Design an enzyme around this catalytic site. Structure first.
Site, PDB file in Angstrom:
ATOM      1  N   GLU A   1       0.803  -1.215   0.000  1.00 55.95           N
ATOM      2  CA  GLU A   1       0.000   0.000   0.000  1.00 55.95           C
ATOM      3  C   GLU A   1       0.849   1.286   0.000  1.00 55.95           C
ATOM      4  OE1 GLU A   1      -3.334   0.300  -0.324  1.00 55.95           O
ATOM      5  OE2 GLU A   1      -4.160  -1.628   0.311  1.00 55.95           O
TER       6      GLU A   1
ATOM      7  N   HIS B   1       2.009   2.194  -3.376  1.00 54.65           N
ATOM      8  CA  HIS B   1       1.078   3.100  -4.031  1.00 54.65           C
ATOM      9  C   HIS B   1       1.362   4.541  -3.600  1.00 54.65           C
ATOM     10  CE1 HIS B   1      -1.209  -0.029  -5.932  1.00 54.65           C
ATOM     11  NE2 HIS B   1      -1.741  -0.507  -4.823  1.00 54.65           N
TER      12      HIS B   1
ATOM     13  N   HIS C   1       0.114  -1.172  -9.906  1.00 55.50           N
ATOM     14  CA  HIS C   1       0.352  -2.601  -9.856  1.00 55.50           C
ATOM     15  C   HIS C   1       1.271  -3.043 -10.998  1.00 55.50           C
ATOM     16  CE1 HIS C   1      -3.569  -2.905  -7.399  1.00 55.50           C
ATOM     17  NE2 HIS C   1      -2.539  -3.050  -6.580  1.00 55.50           N
TER      18      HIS C   1
HETATM   19  C1  LIG Z   1     -11.179   2.349  -8.304  1.00 58.22           C
HETATM   20  C2  LIG Z   1      -9.843   1.634  -8.321  1.00 58.22           C
HETATM   21  C3  LIG Z   1      -9.639   0.481  -7.297  1.00 58.22           C
HETATM   22  C4  LIG Z   1      -8.251   0.415  -6.633  1.00 58.22           C
HETATM   23  C5  LIG Z   1      -8.029  -0.572  -5.499  1.00 58.22           C
HETATM   24  C6  LIG Z   1      -6.588  -0.882  -5.179  1.00 58.22           C
HETATM   25  C7  LIG Z   1      -6.359  -1.743  -3.913  1.00 58.22           C
HETATM   26  N1  LIG Z   1      -4.986  -2.120  -3.787  1.00 58.22           N
HETATM   27  O1  LIG Z   1      -4.418  -2.923  -4.614  1.00 58.22           O
HETATM   28  C8  LIG Z   1      -4.172  -1.594  -2.769  1.00 58.22           C
HETATM   29  O2  LIG Z   1      -2.978  -1.956  -2.749  1.00 58.22           O
HETATM   30  C9  LIG Z   1      -5.749   0.358  -5.060  1.00 58.22           C
HETATM   31  O3  LIG Z   1      -5.826   1.119  -4.105  1.00 58.22           O
HETATM   32  N2  LIG Z   1      -4.786   0.615  -6.153  1.00 58.22           N
HETATM   33  C10 LIG Z   1      -3.945   1.793  -6.101  1.00 58.22           C
HETATM   34  N3  LIG Z   1      -4.776   3.024  -6.173  1.00 58.22           N
HETATM   35  C11 LIG Z   1      -5.531   3.246  -7.334  1.00 58.22           C
HETATM   36  O4  LIG Z   1      -5.508   2.500  -8.231  1.00 58.22           O
HETATM   37  C12 LIG Z   1      -6.380   4.503  -7.314  1.00 58.22           C
HETATM   38  C13 LIG Z   1      -6.977   5.113  -8.443  1.00 58.22           C
HETATM   39  C14 LIG Z   1      -7.677   6.258  -7.936  1.00 58.22           C
HETATM   40  C15 LIG Z   1      -8.462   7.244  -8.630  1.00 58.22           C
HETATM   41  C16 LIG Z   1      -9.068   8.295  -7.901  1.00 58.22           C
HETATM   42  C17 LIG Z   1      -8.892   8.360  -6.502  1.00 58.22           C
HETATM   43  C18 LIG Z   1      -8.119   7.388  -5.785  1.00 58.22           C
HETATM   44  O5  LIG Z   1      -8.043   7.601  -4.402  1.00 58.22           O
HETATM   45  C19 LIG Z   1      -7.459   6.800  -3.408  1.00 58.22           C
HETATM   46  C20 LIG Z   1      -7.497   6.317  -6.532  1.00 58.22           C
HETATM   47  O6  LIG Z   1      -6.691   5.211  -6.167  1.00 58.22           O
HETATM   48 ZN   LIG Z   2      -2.498  -2.391  -4.648  1.00 56.77          ZN
END
Ligand SMILES: CCCCC[C@H](CN(O)CO)C(=O)NCNC(=O)c1cc2cccc(OC)c2o1
Ligand SMILES: [Zn+2]
Ligand SMILES: [Zn+2]
Length: 200
Positions: free
Chosen positions: A94, A97, A103
């Site tokens: 996390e 990120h 990823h």
């Molecule tokens: C809607 C996208 C779902 C993302 C879920 C994943 C969970 N994980 O794998 C955590 O390790 C995630 O959080 N991936 C990384 N973050 C994003 O892809 C992402 C895109 C995004 C767009 C608008 C606002 C956000 O706020 C936190 C975003 O996170």
């Molecule tokens: Zn992730």
């Protein structure tokens, strides 16, 4: 899948943080350990937030969505953690990120290294397997890293535990390479993050 956007790289590698309410002492200890693991292997440093505009907040939230990738800027941003996704290695992922990684399986060159098995993906979870657009990622000359903390497991979002949604294409050291480790930052992750943050 390091971001191509320089505004998402935290300036000077210093990341202010706040830990929100509704965690146990133990969960908070793990957060610090995960931040320290990043600190040990890179020049990135986490600092308790005082008056900074931009900072991360550990927020209690059900598993999955979402941890903002890289620095949002102009205010707080969430790193979301819940009861079933709070172990050391998950938090390190996390924080991957947070520092600016998507990823690994979404690298623009991913089709040279893995197959996506669409038919095994849980309904409505297919968007998790979309490639990043080439302009959104700058890999910094680093090869696709199967051992990455950012790499999905073979059966992530799979309809069943014995069905693969991701399959590496070729054998490395004469055997198909294991993916989805959540133990530590990989050699590849460390190398790549050092370039991203211009570490000494
Ligand atoms: C809607 C996208 C779902 C993302 C879920 C994943 C969970 N994980 O794998 C955590 O390790 C995630 O959080 N991936 C990384 N973050 C994003 O892809 C992402 C895109 C995004 C767009 C608008 C606002 C956000 O706020 C936190 C975003 O996170
Ligand atoms: Zn992730
Ligand atoms: Zn990588």
């Amino acid at each position: 899948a390091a971001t191509s956007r320089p505004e998402r790289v935290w300036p000077d590698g210093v990341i202010p943080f706040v830990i929100g309410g509704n965690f146990t002492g133990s969960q908070r200890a793990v957060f610090r350990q995960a931040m320290r693991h990043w600190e040990k292997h890179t020049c990135v440093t986490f600092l308790e937030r005082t008056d900074e505009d931009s900072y991360i907040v550990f927020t209690y939230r059900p598993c999955g969505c979402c941890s903002y990738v890289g620095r949002r800027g102009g205010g707080p941003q969430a790193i979301s953690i819940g009861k079933n996704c709070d172990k050391f290695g998950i938090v390190v992922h996390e924080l991957g990120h947070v520092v600016g990684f998507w990823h690994e399986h979404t690298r623009p060159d991913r089709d040279r290294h893995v197959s996506i098995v669409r038919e095994n993906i849980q309904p409505g979870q297919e968007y998790n397997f979309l490639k990043m657009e080439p302009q959104e990622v700058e890999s910094l000359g680093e090869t696709y890293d199967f051992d990455s903390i950012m790499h999905y497991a073979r059966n992530t979002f799979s309809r069943g535990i014995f069905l693969d949604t991701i399959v590496p294409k070729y054998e490395v050291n004469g055997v198909k390479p294991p993916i989805g480790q959540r133990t530590r930052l990989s050699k590849g992750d460390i190398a790549q993050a050092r370039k991203l943050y211009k570490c000494p």
